[PDB]
């Protein structure tokens, strides 16, 4: 494509990879709590929510 080619969209991408990175980090960590994901619940021994 050519409508999106340029330096400004790459600059917005590198500007909002903070947004994408925080969005993905929060989503990934929340996906552990939501489904009672023990397999990453153990990667930190600090959440002893399993009784």
């Amino acid at each position: 494509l050519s409508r999106f080619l340029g330096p400004r969209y790459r600059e917005l991408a590198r500007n909002w990879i903070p947004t994408a990175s925080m969005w993905g980090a929060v989503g990934a960590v929340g996906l552990v709590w939501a489904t009672d994901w023990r397999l990453i619940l153990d990667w930190v021994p600090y959440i002893n929510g399993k009784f």
């Binding site: 400004r8 600059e11 917005l12 500007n15 903070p18 947004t19």
Partner: protein, 446 residues
């Protein structure tokens, strides 16, 4: 050929002198046949308590009506006999008087000026004639809507200070203040070293100083009554005023926050930042695709009559903001699209939106200073607020060091998550509330 760099230092310099009382005498000489001469004083509505708020608006409303040597008709008849002009103004913080003549008539001019400021009479019959003219001018300008809203705004953003009272005064107060109140005002504020004698055109510095020493030196240099006020740094509150008046055709709105002072070095980047928003009115030529992101949208959806940006500055505080005039169903669209452009600028700001603003400021600085009347009016304030008139090259070197990061930092400091002040004049019912205006002052993603 001359380049913009080697032509900015060929401007002739600015001599300065002083007297025994303390008057400062400045000038610059350009080789023509015309001159402007004036006096700028250092008193205003800010120096006045609640007991006499409009007093300074008679003294210059009554100055051209006859001294003790030349009555008023004689004075004017004499000045038109030469073919010259007179003018005077006053604001919250300054007052001026000046005349425009032809270069040969400087000795006759400097003599008139010294006669006006130093001694004049207050005629009771002239007071009776004067009072009613004032009382009619009040109603005259109670019908301009770009002047009532810049007064509500000052009233709600400085609620408890001496900087929130009006130049002309309340009506009840312009009905009682009499001869005694005025004569001590004239005695206690009109004095040196609060005065500057400024001249520009084809003047000669030595001749000007000689002529100053004759007519002015009979002047009280030691402070009378030792009335030295202490400056109070200004308070700034977050209020909001609303006036309804449903039968007008259009609505006026203004919004602002706090800013720097006169001598703060943070003014130049804020100028460069406000030149990126811009201005627009519905009679401009090439709208609907002009570079600002706010002008180009109003032109194509037809929401505006006009809008603009302002940067008022005092000795300590300021105001930053915007004014717009609009219909009755397009107000929250305007406020949404306005706050968006500030937030897009607290954060990322590219490196092509900054060279344009730099050029605009650099090119509006020079055109405002071509002529003879502006230069004098410049020399008078630029010396009553710092000293040191600051040549053009020194301004220019402060514009070669603004960058995208600098704009980012200052915009973040003064705009992001702060409480504004808001004023609006009818028909205003789509104006969003204070909660929903305050919550537009920070994104939630960043």
């Amino acid at each position: 050929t001359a380049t913009y760099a080697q032509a900015l230092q060929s401007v002739p310099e600015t001599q300065v002198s002083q007297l025994d009382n303390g008057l400062r005498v400045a000038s610059e000489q350009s080789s023509q046949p015309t001159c402007t001469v004036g006096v700028w004083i250092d008193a205003g509505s800010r120096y006045e308590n609640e007991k006499n708020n409009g007093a300074g608006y008679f003294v210059e409303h009554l100055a051209f009506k006859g001294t003790k040597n030349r009555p008023g008709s004689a004075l004017e008849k004499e000045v038109e006999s030469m073919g010259a002009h007179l003018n005077a103004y006053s604001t919250r913080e300054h007052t001026a008087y000046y005349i425009k003549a032809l270069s040969k008539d400087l000795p006759k001019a400097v003599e008139l000026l010294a006669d006006i400021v130093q001694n004049c009479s207050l005629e009771d019959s002239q007071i009776e004639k004067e009072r009613d003219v004032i009382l009619q001018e009040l109603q005259e300008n109670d019908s301009s809507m770009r002047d009532v809203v810049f007064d509500y705004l000052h009233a709600t953003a400085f609620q408890g200070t001496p900087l929130a009272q009006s130049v002309e005064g309340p009506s009840e107060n312009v009905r009682k203040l009499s001869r005694a109140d005025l004569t001590e005002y004239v005695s206690q504020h009109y004095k040196a070293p609060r005065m500057v004698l400024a001249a520009a055109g084809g003047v000669e510095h030595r001749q000007l100083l000689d002529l100053a020493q004759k007519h002015f030196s009979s002047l009280s240099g030691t402070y009378v009554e030792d009335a030295v006020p202490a400056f109070t740094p200004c308070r700034f509150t977050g209020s909001e005023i609303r006036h309804r008046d449903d039968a007008l055709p259009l609505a006026h709105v203004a919004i602002a926050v706090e800013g720097p002072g006169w001598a703060n070095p943070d003014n130049v980047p804020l100028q460069v930042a406000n030149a990126i928003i811009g201005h627009y009115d519905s009679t401009y030529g090439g709208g609907t695709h002009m570079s600002s992101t706010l002008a180009s949208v109003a032109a194509t959806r037809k929401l505006c009559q006009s809008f603009q940006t302002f940067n008022i500055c005092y000795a300590e505080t300021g105001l930053l903001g915007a004014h717009f005039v609009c219909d009755n169903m397009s107000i929250d669209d305007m406020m949404f699209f306005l706050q968006g452009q500030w937030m897009r600028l607290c954060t990322s700001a590219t490196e092509s939106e900054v060279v344009r603003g730099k050029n605009i400021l650099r090119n509006a600085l020079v055109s405002h200073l071509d002529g003879t009347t502006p230069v004098c009016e410049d020399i008078g304030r630029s010396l009553l607020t710092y000293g040191r008139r600051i040549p053009l090259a020194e301004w220019e070197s402060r514009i070669a060091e603004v960058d995208a990061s600098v704009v980012r930092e200052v915009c973040s400091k003064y705009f992001y998550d702060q409480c504004p002040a808001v004023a609006g004049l009818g028909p205003i019912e789509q104006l969003p509330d204070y909660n929903r205006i305050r919550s537009g002052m920070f994104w939630l993603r960043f």
